[PDB]
Amino acid sequence: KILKPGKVALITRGRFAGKKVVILQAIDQGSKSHPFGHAVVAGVERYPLKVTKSMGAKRIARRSRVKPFIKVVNYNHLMPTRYALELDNLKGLITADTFKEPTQRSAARKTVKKTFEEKYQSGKSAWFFTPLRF
Amino acid sequence: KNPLFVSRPRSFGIGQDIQPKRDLSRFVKW
Amino acid sequence: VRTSTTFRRPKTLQLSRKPKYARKSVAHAPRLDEYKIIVNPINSESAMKKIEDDNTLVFHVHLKANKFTIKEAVRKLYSVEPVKINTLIRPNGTKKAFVKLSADADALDVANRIGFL
Amino acid sequence: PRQISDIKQFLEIARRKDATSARIKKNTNKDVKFKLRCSKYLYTLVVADAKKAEKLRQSLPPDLTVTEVG
Amino acid sequence: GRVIRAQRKSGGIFQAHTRLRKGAAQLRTLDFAERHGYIRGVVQKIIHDPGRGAPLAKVAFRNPYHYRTDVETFVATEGMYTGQFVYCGKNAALTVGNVLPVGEMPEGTIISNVEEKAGDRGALGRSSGNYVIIVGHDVDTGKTRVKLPSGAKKVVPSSARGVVGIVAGGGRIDKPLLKAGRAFHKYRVKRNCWPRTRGVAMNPVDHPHGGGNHQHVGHSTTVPRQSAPGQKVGLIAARRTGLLR
Amino acid sequence: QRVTYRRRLAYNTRSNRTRIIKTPGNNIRYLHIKKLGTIPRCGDTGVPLQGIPALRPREFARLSHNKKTVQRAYGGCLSANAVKDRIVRAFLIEEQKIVKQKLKQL
Amino acid sequence: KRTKKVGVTGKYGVRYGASLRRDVRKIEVQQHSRYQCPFCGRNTVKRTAAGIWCCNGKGCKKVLAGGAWTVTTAAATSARSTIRRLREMV
RNA sequence: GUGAAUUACUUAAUCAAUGAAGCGGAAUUUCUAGCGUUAAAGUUUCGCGAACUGAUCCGCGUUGA
RNA sequence: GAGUUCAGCGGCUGAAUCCGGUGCGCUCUCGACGGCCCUUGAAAAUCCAACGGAAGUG
RNA sequence: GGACAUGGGUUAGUCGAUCCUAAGAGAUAGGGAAGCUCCGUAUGAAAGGCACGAUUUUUCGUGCCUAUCGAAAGGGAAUCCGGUUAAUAUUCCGGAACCAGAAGGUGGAAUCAACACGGCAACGUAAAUGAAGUUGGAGACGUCGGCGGGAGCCCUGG
């Protein structure tokens, strides 16, 4: 039960290795296309750059832009953490069909981006948005 | 006060973050 | 305030040579020109066959001539464009050059115009 | 050293300025081999039908130098 | 009449064969971090150093002043493994493999690669299976008394360092070589010192021992400490010969 | 039939590596070939890396970028298992230094 | 039983003497034996060189410093215990 | 060569280390084979602008025997 | 279309170059392993990749 | 006749040298020595770079950290076939390739969500920016013993 919607986890395998993601929906029972206990997540690919009080507003926006990604990941490849992210506006947007039709996948990516942008500006989940160094 | 302006203090103890550039005038091989 | 334990010697202004006179009164003429590159063509039986078959002239060439200077000397002395140059130093210590002429020109007419056939 | 299975692209490389000559090969097993000398590669095309080979040959631009079996 | 084999050992073909050496085994330079605190390193790899009986450890430390990694070649102690953390300095724990000043370690501890004088990076107790024992301290004069592998007791500065534990590879001389070939191979990766021809088998020109109609020395084999380089053969300045029956 | 070295180097060495070919002229001939390439090895575990060809050093310069690496963090420098250990050990020790700091701050 | 007494030393044949070969036998069976890895428990530790003991267990791959012929020596074990008790006292 | 009532001192010379990296004074980092650099916060002036502190001052004899 | 073999003509013209099996075989190489050592078995030039994020109608 | 006389003959971006370093030789710094020269090779050396800036009192400020020689058997960019000569050929000729470097051009991709997507994953893709600094890898390695695969030769059925 420690893999719940709203829980921050780390992707340990795949292209996005070491990226912090939020559990968007858990299908631990399995599925026909994914016979294992997978969980769809939304995370960050390009973390926003560090900002300085001396920086002008245009660069502050320029560095604060964040590139998200949505992915279904195996439980064994996810590393759950104690941190939790409040996924407001992000409760119902992901479904098996949303992955089947990429137009819903593209819409989900855009909504995930705008939510991550606003949350970053709000200054919440500082650990979630800082890159993990390894 | 922008919340993104978070403090990142560096500890300069033994074994901590890299030592800052200090005045080494008395140790220079003149 | 020094942050480095080493002392590197400072950079000083380095004036360039502005001599009060020339060490040589007159600069020497180019000591390896086109006429000194090409000594005389080789007209042995093997050379003749290369003329008639490979479209290649054979010249007795100065030792210090490279493939570039041979090409320009041939172009200036004969107004023919070589497409390849192959050189060897003969066992007697003289350079021999196989100048392969372009397909537009034939070595036969070039040989007759030179007059060494 | 470059086998081409597409007729058009064989034609287009033939029209391309790098092309210098084309060659015709008539094998005993009755297939026609269109070889196209280019600057860097030699593009050859194998066709199993005579009339397609003939219509291809007349499809070559006139300026290209075509040579029969060597 | 000619200079003897001992006199020709000045260099030339008697140099150490150092083509395959895996680095000089030394402690870290005694810096501020190692004097006032401790610094942690990771044992990258334990390797065999040809011509040496003890394996060497490649411990990687972080440079406290610059963005780079320093790699130090240590004399491996028994129990060292790849990925083990090694702490060097005054506040280092008394764990096998750590480097501490001798003044910070209690009496009776077993240490190796000890410095004779603080800052020479290891002198005493380095051959395989050898170690130095902390006998006692003298805080008033800031000295430490230690027992060496030979049993000689020595006074060292209390700031001298030493690796906790015994040197790896102990028991090397416990196994007989069994044949000249094993001695041949053991000494290729060392100097040119083998095989050793006796002086009695030489001639009067070749050695003081040589000559005669029989293989006899002809004079006492204990020579004075004051003898000339060509005379100094046999038992030099021997205080007592023979077996302890 | 018997063959000879094409070059002036006798004494088969590591650089004098040869192959037998039969030519369109029905000739048995040597072909002087180069040494074999090596798959890049992992930096931490030393295992050869997966997804990269085995080429000589300079021959790696002709490849495309994606043909010499793997799309992952440290991809093309560390194996997947090595990277996974890097990630989990990094995160776990970071949580410790946080929990040690919270312990010592009070 | 192919050899009743000589054991691994049978390769040396009749040379080198009986006693000078028996001590090699004890040392050589120690040197070539497989030892249980302290980190993974798999019986996969084998000597590499004099003093080096490498574990070939997939996922362990740990190298160890030890004795010339055996992984752990009595002198090293005594030193480890005495240093442990000294540290605990200190 | 300098002192003190037999001893001290170090600048002569000797030795040893280094990348001559933190010396002498005062004021007041240890359950893990990970990464650690191109200062950011704070405080004043005019956008990764400057300046001060972050990173105390003093002495200067590179340190140790 | 080359090389090779063969049949003809006075340089030229005809054919054929095909279909398969085998191995404690030799030569070289390659792969996966094994044993040996108080012996553990070069360097550098060169080339690549990664962590990091300077910077940025065009 | 390898004799004697007269002539002719050796063609390379791809084969070597050249480049690299090995053991080792060896100038410079310095110190010896009446000297010839000796010792020395990052040593008791001021041993050389790099970037920012309206241009800085139009007299420059601010930061950032090792020679050379030495291998035609070691390391190493890239060439094969057929043919030709009285004598040369991986060098010439015919055909067919390859590597290194340079410049702009066509076509394609990414881009105002600046720096592509897919796969649970191991990883894949025709592309998919990355300074300084750090780090990893290839180059890069003994020996013997069988076992398996390949190529050439050998054997063999039409």
mmCIF file of C-alpha atoms in Angstrom, chain E:
data_model
loop_
_atom_site.group_PDB
_atom_site.id
_atom_site.type_symbol
_atom_site.label_atom_id
_atom_site.label_comp_id
_atom_site.label_asym_id
_atom_site.label_seq_id
_atom_site.Cartn_x
_atom_site.Cartn_y
_atom_site.Cartn_z
ATOM 1 C CA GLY E 1 93.673 -7.977 -7.399
ATOM 2 C CA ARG E 2 90.293 -7.071 -8.857
ATOM 3 C CA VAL E 3 87.310 -5.475 -7.154
ATOM 4 C CA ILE E 4 85.017 -8.060 -5.591
ATOM 5 C CA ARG E 5 81.367 -8.812 -6.341
ATOM 6 C CA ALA E 6 80.409 -6.844 -3.230
ATOM 7 C CA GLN E 7 82.234 -3.772 -4.547
ATOM 8 C CA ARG E 8 80.517 -3.971 -7.944
ATOM 9 C CA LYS E 9 77.060 -3.777 -6.302
ATOM 10 C CA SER E 10 77.173 0.031 -6.618
ATOM 11 C CA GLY E 11 74.656 0.154 -9.462
ATOM 12 C CA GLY E 12 74.590 -0.640 -13.150
ATOM 13 C CA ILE E 13 73.212 -4.158 -13.587
ATOM 14 C CA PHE E 14 72.398 -4.406 -9.863
ATOM 15 C CA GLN E 15 69.587 -1.836 -9.985
ATOM 16 C CA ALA E 16 66.061 -2.714 -8.913
ATOM 17 C CA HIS E 17 63.786 -3.917 -11.714
ATOM 18 C CA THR E 18 60.928 -1.411 -11.495
ATOM 19 C CA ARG E 19 59.159 -1.862 -14.838
ATOM 20 C CA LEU E 20 56.059 -3.523 -13.353
ATOM 21 C CA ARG E 21 55.791 -1.579 -10.092
ATOM 22 C CA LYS E 22 52.266 -0.607 -9.008
ATOM 23 C CA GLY E 23 53.301 2.626 -7.300
ATOM 24 C CA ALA E 24 55.270 3.579 -4.219
ATOM 25 C CA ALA E 25 53.435 2.526 -1.067
ATOM 26 C CA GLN E 26 53.101 5.675 1.034
ATOM 27 C CA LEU E 27 50.734 7.297 3.481
ATOM 28 C CA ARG E 28 48.881 10.497 2.708
ATOM 29 C CA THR E 29 50.768 13.748 3.063
ATOM 30 C CA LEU E 30 50.132 15.143 6.530
ATOM 31 C CA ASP E 31 47.746 18.002 5.731
ATOM 32 C CA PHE E 32 45.322 20.102 7.777
ATOM 33 C CA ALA E 33 42.483 17.591 7.438
ATOM 34 C CA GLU E 34 44.618 14.689 8.658
ATOM 35 C CA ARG E 35 46.144 16.744 11.504
ATOM 36 C CA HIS E 36 42.967 18.254 12.985
ATOM 37 C CA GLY E 37 40.278 15.787 11.893
ATOM 38 C CA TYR E 38 39.872 12.831 9.553
ATOM 39 C CA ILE E 39 39.350 12.245 5.840
ATOM 40 C CA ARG E 40 37.542 9.282 4.292
ATOM 41 C CA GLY E 41 38.708 7.241 1.329
ATOM 42 C CA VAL E 42 37.318 4.283 -0.593
ATOM 43 C CA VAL E 43 39.407 1.198 -1.379
ATOM 44 C CA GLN E 44 39.115 0.999 -5.162
ATOM 45 C CA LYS E 45 41.175 -2.150 -5.644
ATOM 46 C CA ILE E 46 43.696 -4.459 -3.993
ATOM 47 C CA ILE E 47 46.508 -5.396 -6.366
ATOM 48 C CA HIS E 48 49.723 -7.394 -6.463
ATOM 49 C CA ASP E 49 52.938 -5.386 -6.623
ATOM 50 C CA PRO E 50 55.643 -7.459 -8.357
ATOM 51 C CA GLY E 51 58.786 -7.729 -6.276
ATOM 52 C CA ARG E 52 56.748 -7.227 -3.093
ATOM 53 C CA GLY E 53 55.234 -9.813 -0.781
ATOM 54 C CA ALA E 54 52.386 -7.590 0.408
ATOM 55 C CA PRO E 55 49.394 -6.548 -1.715
ATOM 56 C CA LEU E 56 48.818 -2.846 -2.318
ATOM 57 C CA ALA E 57 45.561 -0.952 -1.844
ATOM 58 C CA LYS E 58 44.421 1.838 -4.172
ATOM 59 C CA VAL E 59 42.482 4.115 -1.818
ATOM 60 C CA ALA E 60 40.810 7.129 -3.423
ATOM 61 C CA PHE E 61 40.458 10.309 -1.364
ATOM 62 C CA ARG E 62 38.777 13.597 -2.178
ATOM 63 C CA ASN E 63 41.008 16.627 -2.515
ATOM 64 C CA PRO E 64 39.942 18.998 0.299
ATOM 65 C CA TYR E 65 40.967 22.107 -1.668
ATOM 66 C CA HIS E 66 40.247 21.329 -5.330
ATOM 67 C CA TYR E 67 37.624 19.549 -7.403
ATOM 68 C CA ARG E 68 39.476 16.314 -8.093
ATOM 69 C CA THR E 69 40.127 12.904 -6.563
ATOM 70 C CA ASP E 70 43.442 11.892 -4.998
ATOM 71 C CA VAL E 71 44.464 8.231 -5.190
ATOM 72 C CA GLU E 72 46.867 6.884 -2.573
ATOM 73 C CA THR E 73 48.814 3.621 -2.738
ATOM 74 C CA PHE E 74 48.723 1.963 0.682
ATOM 75 C CA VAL E 75 50.220 -1.207 2.108
ATOM 76 C CA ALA E 76 47.154 -3.413 2.446
ATOM 77 C CA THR E 77 46.312 -4.778 5.887
ATOM 78 C CA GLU E 78 44.516 -8.049 6.530
ATOM 79 C CA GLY E 79 40.769 -7.541 6.336
ATOM 80 C CA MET E 80 40.900 -4.757 3.749
ATOM 81 C CA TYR E 81 38.367 -5.260 0.976
ATOM 82 C CA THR E 82 37.276 -3.333 -2.088
ATOM 83 C CA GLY E 83 34.723 -0.694 -1.172
ATOM 84 C CA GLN E 84 35.896 -0.435 2.428
ATOM 85 C CA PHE E 85 36.077 3.084 3.832
ATOM 86 C CA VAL E 86 39.432 4.161 5.272
ATOM 87 C CA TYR E 87 39.563 7.113 7.665
ATOM 88 C CA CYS E 88 42.897 8.902 8.066
ATOM 89 C CA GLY E 89 43.581 11.508 10.721
ATOM 90 C CA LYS E 90 43.610 12.475 14.389
ATOM 91 C CA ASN E 91 39.910 11.743 14.955
ATOM 92 C CA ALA E 92 39.914 8.492 12.981
ATOM 93 C CA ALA E 93 38.378 5.547 14.801
ATOM 94 C CA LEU E 94 40.595 2.736 16.089
ATOM 95 C CA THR E 95 39.489 0.306 13.389
ATOM 96 C CA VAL E 96 41.719 -1.965 11.319
ATOM 97 C CA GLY E 97 42.848 -0.083 8.224
ATOM 98 C CA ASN E 98 42.517 3.432 9.644
ATOM 99 C CA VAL E 99 45.496 5.777 9.974
ATOM 100 C CA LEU E 100 45.977 7.518 13.325
ATOM 101 C CA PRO E 101 48.823 9.319 15.079
ATOM 102 C CA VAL E 102 50.669 7.016 17.445
ATOM 103 C CA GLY E 103 49.919 9.472 20.249
ATOM 104 C CA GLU E 104 46.188 8.825 19.833
ATOM 105 C CA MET E 105 46.412 5.030 20.081
ATOM 106 C CA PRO E 106 46.565 3.134 23.394
ATOM 107 C CA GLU E 107 49.388 0.863 24.471
ATOM 108 C CA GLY E 108 49.435 -2.632 23.026
ATOM 109 C CA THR E 109 47.702 -1.804 19.751
ATOM 110 C CA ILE E 110 49.011 -3.447 16.579
ATOM 111 C CA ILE E 111 50.001 -0.988 13.851
ATOM 112 C CA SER E 112 51.964 -1.060 10.613
ATOM 113 C CA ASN E 113 53.503 1.274 8.029
ATOM 114 C CA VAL E 114 54.539 3.501 10.924
ATOM 115 C CA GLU E 115 56.326 6.779 10.289
ATOM 116 C CA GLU E 116 59.763 7.156 11.823
ATOM 117 C CA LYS E 117 59.274 10.939 11.940
ATOM 118 C CA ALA E 118 55.890 12.528 11.266
ATOM 119 C CA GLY E 119 55.686 13.379 7.574
ATOM 120 C CA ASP E 120 57.843 10.709 5.903
ATOM 121 C CA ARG E 121 54.728 8.659 5.013
ATOM 122 C CA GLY E 122 55.595 5.224 6.378
ATOM 123 C CA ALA E 123 58.818 3.522 7.393
ATOM 124 C CA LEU E 124 58.349 0.756 9.979
ATOM 125 C CA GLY E 125 56.398 -2.488 9.763
ATOM 126 C CA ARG E 126 55.677 -2.819 6.048
ATOM 127 C CA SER E 127 56.743 -6.287 4.916
ATOM 128 C CA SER E 128 54.001 -8.884 4.739
ATOM 129 C CA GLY E 129 52.849 -10.037 8.158
ATOM 130 C CA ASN E 130 55.007 -7.527 10.045
ATOM 131 C CA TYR E 131 53.724 -4.948 12.500
ATOM 132 C CA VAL E 132 54.789 -2.460 15.161
ATOM 133 C CA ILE E 133 53.446 -2.533 18.727
ATOM 134 C CA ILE E 134 52.786 0.603 20.780
ATOM 135 C CA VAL E 135 54.754 0.022 23.984
ATOM 136 C CA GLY E 136 54.171 3.283 25.830
ATOM 137 C CA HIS E 137 53.743 7.038 25.738
ATOM 138 C CA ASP E 138 55.695 9.984 27.148
ATOM 139 C CA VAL E 139 53.339 12.964 26.990
ATOM 140 C CA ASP E 140 55.770 15.357 28.688
ATOM 141 C CA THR E 141 58.324 15.070 25.870
ATOM 142 C CA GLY E 142 55.679 14.231 23.257
ATOM 143 C CA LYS E 143 57.219 10.905 22.255
ATOM 144 C CA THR E 144 55.989 7.348 21.778
ATOM 145 C CA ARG E 145 57.952 4.159 22.424
ATOM 146 C CA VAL E 146 57.293 1.316 19.981
ATOM 147 C CA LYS E 147 58.482 -2.258 19.490
ATOM 148 C CA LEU E 148 59.718 -3.020 15.978
ATOM 149 C CA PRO E 149 59.451 -6.363 14.149
ATOM 150 C CA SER E 150 63.123 -6.999 14.960
ATOM 151 C CA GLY E 151 62.318 -6.483 18.644
ATOM 152 C CA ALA E 152 64.281 -3.241 18.878
ATOM 153 C CA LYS E 153 62.448 -0.532 20.805
ATOM 154 C CA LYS E 154 62.409 2.935 19.266
ATOM 155 C CA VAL E 155 61.224 6.392 20.308
ATOM 156 C CA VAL E 156 59.113 8.145 17.669
ATOM 157 C CA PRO E 157 57.318 11.504 17.633
ATOM 158 C CA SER E 158 53.806 11.240 19.026
ATOM 159 C CA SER E 159 52.502 12.788 15.790
ATOM 160 C CA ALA E 160 53.867 9.920 13.684
ATOM 161 C CA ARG E 161 51.113 7.933 11.990
ATOM 162 C CA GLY E 162 50.553 4.229 11.484
ATOM 163 C CA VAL E 163 47.989 1.990 9.812
ATOM 164 C CA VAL E 164 45.979 -0.036 12.318
ATOM 165 C CA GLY E 165 46.407 -3.780 11.834
ATOM 166 C CA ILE E 166 49.018 -6.160 10.487
ATOM 167 C CA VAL E 167 50.315 -6.178 6.923
ATOM 168 C CA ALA E 168 48.519 -8.541 4.549
ATOM 169 C CA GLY E 169 50.217 -11.576 3.064
ATOM 170 C CA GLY E 170 51.627 -12.988 6.288
ATOM 171 C CA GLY E 171 53.258 -16.392 6.221
ATOM 172 C CA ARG E 172 54.993 -15.890 2.875
ATOM 173 C CA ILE E 173 58.330 -17.309 4.073
ATOM 174 C CA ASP E 174 56.563 -20.181 5.847
ATOM 175 C CA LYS E 175 56.474 -22.240 2.596
ATOM 176 C CA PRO E 176 59.773 -23.542 1.169
ATOM 177 C CA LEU E 177 60.668 -22.454 -2.350
ATOM 178 C CA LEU E 178 61.383 -26.124 -3.245
ATOM 179 C CA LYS E 179 63.625 -25.395 -6.224
ATOM 180 C CA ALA E 180 66.027 -22.947 -7.823
ATOM 181 C CA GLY E 181 63.421 -22.065 -10.439
ATOM 182 C CA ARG E 182 61.131 -20.613 -7.782
ATOM 183 C CA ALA E 183 64.091 -18.644 -6.436
ATOM 184 C CA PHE E 184 64.868 -17.603 -10.009
ATOM 185 C CA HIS E 185 61.385 -16.215 -10.556
ATOM 186 C CA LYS E 186 61.164 -14.641 -7.098
ATOM 187 C CA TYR E 187 64.300 -12.611 -7.837
ATOM 188 C CA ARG E 188 63.688 -11.539 -11.442
ATOM 189 C CA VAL E 189 61.184 -8.971 -10.162
ATOM 190 C CA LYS E 190 63.827 -7.806 -7.700
ATOM 191 C CA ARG E 191 67.468 -6.802 -8.064
ATOM 192 C CA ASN E 192 70.242 -8.915 -9.619
ATOM 193 C CA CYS E 193 71.369 -10.781 -6.514
ATOM 194 C CA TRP E 194 70.916 -14.469 -7.413
ATOM 195 C CA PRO E 195 72.409 -17.047 -7.634
ATOM 196 C CA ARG E 196 75.137 -16.445 -5.021
ATOM 197 C CA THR E 197 78.575 -17.941 -5.670
ATOM 198 C CA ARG E 198 80.698 -18.540 -2.590
ATOM 199 C CA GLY E 199 84.000 -16.736 -2.218
ATOM 200 C CA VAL E 200 85.853 -19.949 -1.384
ATOM 201 C CA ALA E 201 84.989 -21.171 -4.896
ATOM 202 C CA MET E 202 86.692 -18.111 -6.396
ATOM 203 C CA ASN E 203 90.372 -17.246 -6.822
ATOM 204 C CA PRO E 204 92.669 -15.017 -4.743
ATOM 205 C CA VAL E 205 92.120 -12.223 -7.266
ATOM 206 C CA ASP E 206 88.333 -12.595 -7.016
ATOM 207 C CA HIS E 207 87.822 -12.578 -3.248
ATOM 208 C CA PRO E 208 89.689 -12.684 0.082
ATOM 209 C CA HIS E 209 88.215 -16.155 0.662
ATOM 210 C CA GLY E 210 89.380 -17.567 -2.654
ATOM 211 C CA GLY E 211 92.494 -19.563 -3.400
ATOM 212 C CA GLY E 212 94.420 -22.456 -1.944
ATOM 213 C CA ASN E 213 94.620 -26.121 -2.816
ATOM 214 C CA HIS E 214 91.518 -26.642 -0.639
ATOM 215 C CA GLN E 215 88.366 -24.557 -0.159
ATOM 216 C CA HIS E 216 89.327 -22.924 3.130
ATOM 217 C CA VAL E 217 89.040 -19.299 4.215
ATOM 218 C CA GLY E 218 92.588 -19.114 5.574
ATOM 219 C CA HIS E 219 91.851 -16.321 8.059
ATOM 220 C CA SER E 220 89.167 -15.480 10.595
ATOM 221 C CA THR E 221 85.906 -14.680 8.846
ATOM 222 C CA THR E 222 84.883 -11.980 11.357
ATOM 223 C CA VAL E 223 86.343 -8.766 9.918
ATOM 224 C CA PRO E 224 86.501 -5.415 11.755
ATOM 225 C CA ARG E 225 83.940 -2.696 11.230
ATOM 226 C CA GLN E 226 86.865 -0.475 10.178
ATOM 227 C CA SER E 227 87.996 -2.652 7.273
ATOM 228 C CA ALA E 228 88.262 -1.298 3.746
ATOM 229 C CA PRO E 229 85.374 -1.885 1.319
ATOM 230 C CA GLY E 230 87.337 -4.650 -0.407
ATOM 231 C CA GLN E 231 88.233 -6.224 2.946
ATOM 232 C CA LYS E 232 84.712 -6.097 4.418
ATOM 233 C CA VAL E 233 83.557 -9.631 3.624
ATOM 234 C CA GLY E 234 82.297 -12.429 5.827
ATOM 235 C CA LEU E 235 80.853 -11.578 9.237
ATOM 236 C CA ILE E 236 81.248 -7.818 9.614
ATOM 237 C CA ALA E 237 81.796 -6.595 13.188
ATOM 238 C CA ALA E 238 80.367 -9.803 14.626
ATOM 239 C CA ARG E 239 79.795 -9.576 18.375
ATOM 240 C CA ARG E 240 78.984 -13.291 18.731
ATOM 241 C CA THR E 241 79.111 -16.195 16.273
ATOM 242 C CA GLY E 242 77.935 -19.790 16.388
ATOM 243 C CA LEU E 243 74.696 -21.428 17.445
ATOM 244 C CA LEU E 244 73.023 -20.923 20.810
ATOM 245 C CA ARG E 245 73.315 -24.567 21.822
#
